[PDB]
Design an enzyme around this catalytic site. Structure first.
Site, PDB file in Angstrom:
ATOM      1  NE  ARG A 110      14.603  28.581  55.663  1.00  0.00           N
ATOM      2  CZ  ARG A 110      14.130  28.264  54.462  1.00  0.00           C
ATOM      3  NH1 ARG A 110      14.031  26.995  54.088  1.00  0.00           N
ATOM      4  NH2 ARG A 110      13.780  29.228  53.621  1.00  0.00           N
ATOM      5  CE  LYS A 138      12.405  31.377  59.046  1.00  0.00           C
ATOM      6  NZ  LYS A 138      11.257  32.322  59.096  1.00  0.00           N
ATOM      7  CG  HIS A 175       6.808  33.126  57.191  1.00  0.00           C
ATOM      8  ND1 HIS A 175       7.417  33.046  55.957  1.00  0.00           N
ATOM      9  CD2 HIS A 175       7.812  33.210  58.098  1.00  0.00           C
ATOM     10  CE1 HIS A 175       8.728  33.081  56.110  1.00  0.00           C
ATOM     11  NE2 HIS A 175       8.995  33.181  57.402  1.00  0.00           N
ATOM     12  CB  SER A 189      13.726  35.494  54.536  1.00  0.00           C
ATOM     13  OG  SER A 189      14.193  34.631  53.516  1.00  0.00           O
ATOM     14  CE  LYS A 217       8.620  37.539  57.058  1.00  0.00           C
ATOM     15  NZ  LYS A 217       8.290  36.195  57.601  1.00  0.00           N
ATOM     16  CB  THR A 218      13.152  42.773  58.974  1.00  0.00           C
ATOM     17  OG1 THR A 218      13.104  41.364  59.237  1.00  0.00           O
ATOM     18  CG2 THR A 218      13.962  43.453  60.081  1.00  0.00           C
ATOM     19  CG  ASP A 249      10.587  35.750  60.313  1.00  0.00           C
ATOM     20  OD1 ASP A 249      10.390  36.091  59.133  1.00  0.00           O
ATOM     21  OD2 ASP A 249      10.999  34.611  60.619  1.00  0.00           O
ATOM     22  NE  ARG A 285      18.842  35.545  57.141  1.00  0.00           N
ATOM     23  CZ  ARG A 285      17.528  35.385  57.017  1.00  0.00           C
ATOM     24  NH1 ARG A 285      16.713  35.726  58.007  1.00  0.00           N
ATOM     25  NH2 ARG A 285      17.031  34.878  55.897  1.00  0.00           N
TER      26      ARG A 285
END
Lengths: 514, 522
Positions: free
Chosen positions: B42, B185, B204, B222, B226-227, B241, B306
């Site tokens: 980003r 996002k 989030h 990230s 989380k994943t 996410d 990713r």
């Protein structure tokens, strides 16, 4: 000069197919859907075995094996090589035929169509990176110039299609046909000559193994049960079409499965249906415009739709497809007349007779046929040669032989009879594998002399004895008489002259049911 | 001028990507492997929110939310639409954001790159054919002209990259970046404003539910777990996410997962690894020349590799990604200093403090201009780059939600232990963290005795099944107590500075009492 693509990865071949094959596309699950165009099946009339001194004496020349001069072969090879050498792209696939390293063959395939390369990558055994780097000289080379027509004026040719195998130069030339099966069956034919040379038995049969290591092989022509019957929830798949019986046991000739796609569904054929995904090929199948899913029931292109996928796509299938000596040997007879028993336990004498006679039926209304060793179109030596090999093998390993009717029951196919219930055949196979069928009591099926079981768990008694399944006993006798006559004529033409005492006594006779 | 392709099937999009995207190819398993080129993360510095009257008073303007005049938005929008209209091919993806039908948004995405279309087909919710026929006018439109540079001279911009969101016209314009996450996002940012308007809590966090229906949410930036942690063999995945906590429970905003691919393997993360197949996308990943499979350890392109796959690729994931009210709320802190406990059970007071403080780590790649190495960071509500309102707004929502639903709050260190990462310390064993989560879900951790972690005042378990006792208290894990004291001291100072700069002045007495203090262990 052509850009040569050597041993590309499956994803790379898919990419090439999408780019240069106009009608190729991906299914909703990633399978590569393609079409073979003009030819959607084998061209047996155009198959040739070069008439070379090294094999002339052993080749059973006739309706299946037809001579082609070395001069004519040289001419078709030239046409094939010049076509391959003048394409913008050439694909090469180095692979092995056979899972047992002591007996496997190194094969090199040249194709112009990317899907043919993917097909061979899927259908034969992929060498390791080290093996590729040191591949050396292949044992056999296939020049698939199938997109190019042959010159029908060449001596020995009968059309623009030519599938010739030269055992001396160890080469297969393919012209005028894009049906992928021609490559696969060409390799099977090679095995049907090389294994005899090594005293091993090549078999047109599928095979699987039980938890206890008991191996079962199923002989039969395509579409008569080999794939569906070898796919067993309780047994690991070894292979669905071609195997070799050696001193060490059996080995699958292939590294994948080229199954008929007709009627595939997640309900009755989950594992196979699920295998038709990325890395697999769909040949001559039709896709649904809405979802991009294959309509496995759509035969608008042909009645020989196919899917090809690596063995690894089948859960439970052996990574290294080799196993012990067959405990049970099964002959699949797709009887269109409805007079063959759901199951009969064959004696050693009957085994020989029924194996070489090869009574069954070819699928597209099911046409009855006698196909030697249930693989007539691919045999190189005479049926008796293989019959003697099997007899010796089964005797030495005490294999139990069975005859299973995968065709019709209660009547004739051409008169609207119903097909032998798949559920019954599977029940019979479970009984063979559970050991019960081998211990139950048997009765003789008159005239045919076959030994049928009086009882089998999950199977209706009126089915065990075909006679009981027919409504009109008169029609049963008439049909039985007709088929017996067919067996006698086939035998008289094919084996009588040199038949042994046991063989002649195994020939069925007509006994009108009183 | 362009041939417009609307709502194509995944295989069609893959075919298009292979045909027009020069460097795109297929992996050994059929995933579409592509490159986003210049931008592999980003560009927060280039993110803008249009200065429209309808939101101006509520937006927390600052280093994250930066105004863009309505006139300048019109300029970038013109550049975008002009570019899109002059391409040979244009791809349109109509979809839904939000599994809760009373709050879902109809989103239309315009892209020039086929993989961006496949990405959104996977990442948002695919409408039924019936819904597409009656899709009508979308609530929001994304113009992804990322392959086209923006005019840097445009007032308000500082580069050729621009990711602008206009809440008034309900449009997002993307220029100067082909990183797919910008689209994802952007929708998250929209939800971080629209949900507050309906007083629902946008989070989030990833989420999953147990056999008994108990829901757990995991907050974090990230690359902090989380994943990984939501993909539980014993629980059904809801999302990895972005979720919203409504009056009925929670709902996933997405229809897929855009997972960090670094280190994925069938050994420790089989479920996620197995999802990287046909229908999925691999972004900025390098393939093994001889295998054709992604080399998940190769970060030669970037450290933010990713993979994106539909939720349908995860076994047991809920079809309709909605569930009840979170029974357990987890804050993931990727602590590079190795002083945070593997697990702490937070009081209601501590919960609000840790939530708004958002201490964790900013991993490499995710955002532009970073160092190849992770940096400790304080990100509001563990979602700082995407918040629209002030952190305190969300903090108050969470406090009210957890209080009303008796949620239990936990703090999990998913970073390092026994020392500092920059000194060679080992990361927190995934096995430990997984065992800890199992103890949270089995109810045993909530029934064990706790002790106080000095200075920090965190309540840590004296015992946890399958977890070495010496790890429960960070102190016991360090080899040199002197080094432990100096690092804890350094981190405490960082917390105090952050709190004083961000919330101290207006903080309540309860909030201020939650501020950690340094207590030398002697």
């Amino acid at each position: 000069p052509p850009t040569i693509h050597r041993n590309l990865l499956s994803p790379e071949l898919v990419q090439w197919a999408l780019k240069i094959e106009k009608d190729s596309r991906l299914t909703a699950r990633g399978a590569l859907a393609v079409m073979s165009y003009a030819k959607t099946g084998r061209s047996p009339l155009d198959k040739r075995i070069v008439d070379t001194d090294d094999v002339r004496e052993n080749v059973d020349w006739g309706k299946v094996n037809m001579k082609l001069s070395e001069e004519s072969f040289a001419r078709v090879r030239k046409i094939a090589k010049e076509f391959l050498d003048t394409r913008e792209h050439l694909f090469v696939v180095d692979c092995f035929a056979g899972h047992d390293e002591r007996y496997r063959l190194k094969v090199r395939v040249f194709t112009t169509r990317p899907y043919h390369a993917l097909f061979m990558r899927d259908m034969l055994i992929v060498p390791t990176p080290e093996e590729l780097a040191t591949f050396g000289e292949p044992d056999y080379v296939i020049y698939n110039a199938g997109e190019c027509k042959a010159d029908p004026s060449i001596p020995g040719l009968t059309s623009t299609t030519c599938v010739a195998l030269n055992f001396k130069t160890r080469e297969q030339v393919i012209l005028g046909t894009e049906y992928a099966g021609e490559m696969k069956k060409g390799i099977l034919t090679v095995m049907f000559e090389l294994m005899p040379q090594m005293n091993h038995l090549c078999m047109h049969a599928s095979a699987n193994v039980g938890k206890q290591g008991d191996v079962t092989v199923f002989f039969g022509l395509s579409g008569t049960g080999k794939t569906t019957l070898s796919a067993d929830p309780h047994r690991n798949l070894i292979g669905d079409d071609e195997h070799v019986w050696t001193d060490r046991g059996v080995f699958n000739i292939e590294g994948g499965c080229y199954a008929k796609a007709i009627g595939l569904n997640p309900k009755t054929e989950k594992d196979i249906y699920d295998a038709v995904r990325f890395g697999a090929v769909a040949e001559n199948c039709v896709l649904d415009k809405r979802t991009g899913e294959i309509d496995f029931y759509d035969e608008s292109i042909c009645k020989n739709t196919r899917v090809a996928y690596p063995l690894s796509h089948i859960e439970g299938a052996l990574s290294k497809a080799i196993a012990g000596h067959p405990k049970n040997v099964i002959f699949l007879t797709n009887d269109a007349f409805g007079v063959m028993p759901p199951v009969a336990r064959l004696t050693s004498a009957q085994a020989m007779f029924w194996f070489v006679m090869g009574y069954t039926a070819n699928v597209p209304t099911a046409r009855p046929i006698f196909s030697s060793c249930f693989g007539g179109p691919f045999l190189v030596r005479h049926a008796t040669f293989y019959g003697e090999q099997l007899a010796e093998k089964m005797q030495k390993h005490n294999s139990r032989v069975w005859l299973l009717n995968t065709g019709y029951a209660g009547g004739r196919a051409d008169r609207g009879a119903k097909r032998m219930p798949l559920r019954v055949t599977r029940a019979i196979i479970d009984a063979i594998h559970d050991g019960t069928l081998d211990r139950t009591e048997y009765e003789e099926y008159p005239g045919w002399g076959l030994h049928i079981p009086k009882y089998v768990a999950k199977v209706p008694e009126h089915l065990l004895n075909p006679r009981k399944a027919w409504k009109d006993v008169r029609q049963f006798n008439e049909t039985s008489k007709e088929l017996v006559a067919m067996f006698q004529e086939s035998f008289s033409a094919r084996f009588a002259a040199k038949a042994s005492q046991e063989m002649k006594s195994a020939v069925p006779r007509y006994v009108e049911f009183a």
